[PDB]
Amino acid sequence: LPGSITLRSNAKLNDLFTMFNGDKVTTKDKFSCRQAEMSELIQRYELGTLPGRPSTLTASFSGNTLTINCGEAGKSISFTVTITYPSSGTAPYPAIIGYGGGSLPAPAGVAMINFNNDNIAAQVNTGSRGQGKFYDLYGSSHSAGAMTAWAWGVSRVIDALELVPGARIDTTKIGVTGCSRNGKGAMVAGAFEKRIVLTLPQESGAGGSACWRISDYLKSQGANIQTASEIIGEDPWFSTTFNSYVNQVPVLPFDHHSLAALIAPRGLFVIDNNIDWLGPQSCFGCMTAAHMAWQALGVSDHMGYSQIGAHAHCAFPSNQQSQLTAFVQKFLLGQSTNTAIFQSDFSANQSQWIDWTTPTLS
Numbered sequence: 001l002p003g004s005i006t007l008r009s010n011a012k013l014n015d016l017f018t019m020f021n022g023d024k025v026t027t028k029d030k031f032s033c034r035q036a037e038m039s040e041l042i043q044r045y046e047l048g049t050l051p052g053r054p055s056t057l058t059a060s061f062s063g064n065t066l067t068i069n070c071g072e073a074g075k076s077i078s079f080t081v082t083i084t085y086p087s088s089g090t091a092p093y094p095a096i097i098g099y100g101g102g103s104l105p106a107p108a109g110v111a112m113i114n115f116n117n118d119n120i121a122a123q124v125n126t127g128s129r130g131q132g133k134f135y136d137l138y139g140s141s142h143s144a145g146a147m148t149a150w151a152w153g154v155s156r157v158i159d160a161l162e163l164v165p166g167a168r169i170d171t172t173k174i175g176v177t178g179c180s181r182n183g184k185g186a187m188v189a190g191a192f193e194k195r196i197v198l199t200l201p202q203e204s205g206a207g208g209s210a211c212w213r214i215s216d217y218l219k220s221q222g223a224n225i226q227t228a229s230e231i232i233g234e235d236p237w238f239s240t241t242f243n244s245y246v247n248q249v250p251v252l253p254f255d256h257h258s259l260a261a262l263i264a265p266r267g268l269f270v271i272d273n274n275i276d277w278l279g280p281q282s283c284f285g286c287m288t289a290a291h292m293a294w295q296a297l298g299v300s301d302h303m304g305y306s307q308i309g310a311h312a313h314c315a316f317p318s319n320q321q322s323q324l325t326a327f328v329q330k331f332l333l334g335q336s337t338n339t340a341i342f343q344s345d346f347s348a349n350q351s352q353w354i355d356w357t358t359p360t361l362s
Contacts, residue, residue: 001020001037001040001041005020005253007251007252007253008251008253009248009250009251010250010251010253011213011250012213012352012353012354012355013211013213013214013255013257013285013286013289013353013354014252014253014254014255014257014258015355015356016034016038016257016258016261016289016290016292016293016296016356017031017034017296017356017357017358017359018356019033019034019037020037020041020253025359025361026359026361026362027361027362028297028361028362030361031264031293031296031297031361035261035262035264038254038258038259038261038262039191039192039262041253041254041258042254042258042259042262043148043239044241045239045241045242045245045252045253046145046238046239046241046242046245046252047144047145047147047148047188047238047239047242048142048143048144048145048148048238048239048241049142049143049144049148050144050148050151050152050192051072051138051142051144051152053155053156053159054070054071054072054137054156055071055072055073056069056070056071056072056076057069057070057071057156057159057160057163058163059159059160059161059163059164060164061164061166061167064082064083064084064085065080065081065082065083066080066081066082066083066113066157066160066161066164066167067079067080068080068081068156068157068159068160070137070156072137072138075136075137075138076137077133077134077136077137078133079116079119079120079133079153079156080116081097081113081114081115081116081157082113082114083095083111083112083113083114083167083169084106084111084112084114085111085168086106086107086108086109086110086111088108088109089108089109089110089111091168092165092168092169092170092171093109093110093111093168093169093170093173094109094110094111094169094170094173094174094175094332094333095110095111095112095113095169095170095173095174095175095332096110096111096112096113096174096175096176096177096198096200096332097113097115097154097157097158097174097175097176097177097189098112098113098114098115098176098177098178099115099117099150099176099177099178099182099185099186100114100115100116100117100118100178100182101114102177102178102179102182102186102200102202103177103178103179103180103182103202103314103315103316104177104179104200104202104271104316104324105316105321105324107324107325107328107332108325109333110175110328110332110333111168111169113157113169115153115154115157117146117150117153117178117182117185118132119132119133120132120133120134120149120150120152120153121133121134121135121144121146121147121149121150121153121236122146122236123146123181123235123236123237124235125234125235126233126234126235126236128146128235128236129236129240130142130236132146132149133153134149134150134152134153135149143239143240143241144239145236145237145238145239145240145242146185146235146236146237146238147184147185147188147207147237147238148188148192148239150185150188150189151185151188151189151191151192151193152192154176154189154193154196155192155193155195158171158174158193158195158196161174171195172195172197173197173331173332173333173334174195174196174197175196175197175198175199175200175267175328175331175332176189176190176193176196176198176199176200177199177200177201177202178201178202178204179202179203179204179313179314180202180203180204180205180313180314181207181235181237183201183202183203183204183205183208183209184201184204184205184206184207184208184237185237186199186200186201186202186204186208187199187201187204187208187209187256187259187260188259190263190266190268191259191260191262191263192262194266196263196266197266197267197331197332198266198267198268198269198327198328198331198332199263199266199267199268199269200268200269200271200324200327201270201271202271202272202314202316203271203272203273203275203278203313203314204270204272204278204283205226205275205277205278205279205283206225206226206227206228206230206231206278206279206282207226207231207237207238208256208283209256209260209270209272209283209286209287209305210226210256210278210279210282210283210286211255211256211257211282211283211285211286211289211353212227212228212249212252212255212256213249213250213255213353214279214281214282214285214286214349214353215227215228215279215282216228216249217282218279218281218282223276223279224276224277225276225277225278225279225282226277226278226279228242228245228246228247228249229246229247231246232246255286256286256290257286257287257289257290258290259290260286260287260290260293260303261290261292261293263303264293264294264297264299264302264303265294265297265299265302266302266331267302267303267327267330267331268302268303268304269303269304269305269306269323269324269327269339269341270283270287270303270304270305270306271306271316271320271324272284272305272306272307272344273307273310273311273313273317274307274309274310274345274346275310275313280307280344280345280346281344281346281347281349283307283344284305284307284344284346284347284348285346285347285348285349285350285353287303287305288305288342288348288350288354289350289353289354290303291303291305291342292354292358295358296358296359296360296361297361298360298361300340301338301339301340302339303342304323304326304327304339304340304341304342305341305342305343305344306320306323306341306342306343306344307343307344307345307346308320308343308345309345323341325337326338326339326341327339327341
């Protein structure tokens with residue numbers, strides 16, 4: 001991808017199957033390139049640069065705590081995660097890395113890893129910019145926004161689990177989850193860390209499952225919905241660069257359907273809810289487009305979406321329990337449960353937001 005490119009406005013959701021330069025994506029290999037391109041673009045304009053594995057990484061396990069040590073260019077940091085094990089299952093256990101513990105019921109036979117994303121990158125308010133262990137290592141002025149920093153952290157947790165089998169976690173069966181602000185984070189983690197087999201963003205709304213374009217449209221129609229321009233003023237989740245496009249979203253060579261598509265063909269189950277601020281119709285329209293990535297790869301049932309009525313924020317509803325379990329069993333436990341789950345009480349509005357077709361990738 002050229003270092004210098006000229007952005008152009010696109011009112012609708014960007015075509016997932018056409019490279020930025022216009023080349024058509026017709027093969028699975030080509031889509032892999034397209035994904036790398038979308039990740040590159042997303043990092044450049046919205047989330048900031050994602051660092052690779054640090055030069056120094058060591059770990060140790062004691063009690064139920066995993067300690068991770070990272071070093072890079074003379075700098076070094078240390079952080080920990082706590083682990084809870086299931087009453088059922090066989091060790092090494094598959095596990096879900098939960099931001100702040102997440103807000104989902106602990107799955108049967110699945111271990112829970114409590115990831116304190118705040119310590120990796122603070123999210124108290126705008127003043128948290130550049131504060132956190134990630135920055136203590138890469139620098140206060142690193143372009144990475146908090147969500148990218150968090151994702152980097154998750155990757156380090158996985159590296160550590162690979163180094164310490166004594167933690168008794170199956171590194172080939174790791175998922176990620178988070179609710180509300182941590183949901184946006186979980187989405188980014190699944191997108192940036194390919195080792196994650198199941199991504200469970202819970203009620204992530206703006207910055208997560210919602211598309212910037214659809215939320216803006218809804219706002220202009222009078223909806224009390226969170227949008228890009230308003231969200232960047234609450235915390236440093238996105239790169240500072242993003243503040244330059246927040247009020248001109250159409251020029252972005254992507255949207256969150258692109259972000260979600262980075263997870264394909266891996267497991268993804270979006271757990272949503274009807275709360276106006278989240279923008280449920282924007283999330284559904286957005287994810288409907290994202291789903292086309294899996295449809296193209298011939299694995300439609302690897303991505304699910306569910307919004308059923310309304311309920312208290314982050315209080316996981318019983319009417320979604322069987323759906324979550326289906327995805328957990330398939331991706332974390334290796335079962336073949338049915339995962340054809342894609343519903344919302346809102347209209348996707350595909351004719352309005354999607355003007356591209358979905359190819360059968362070779």
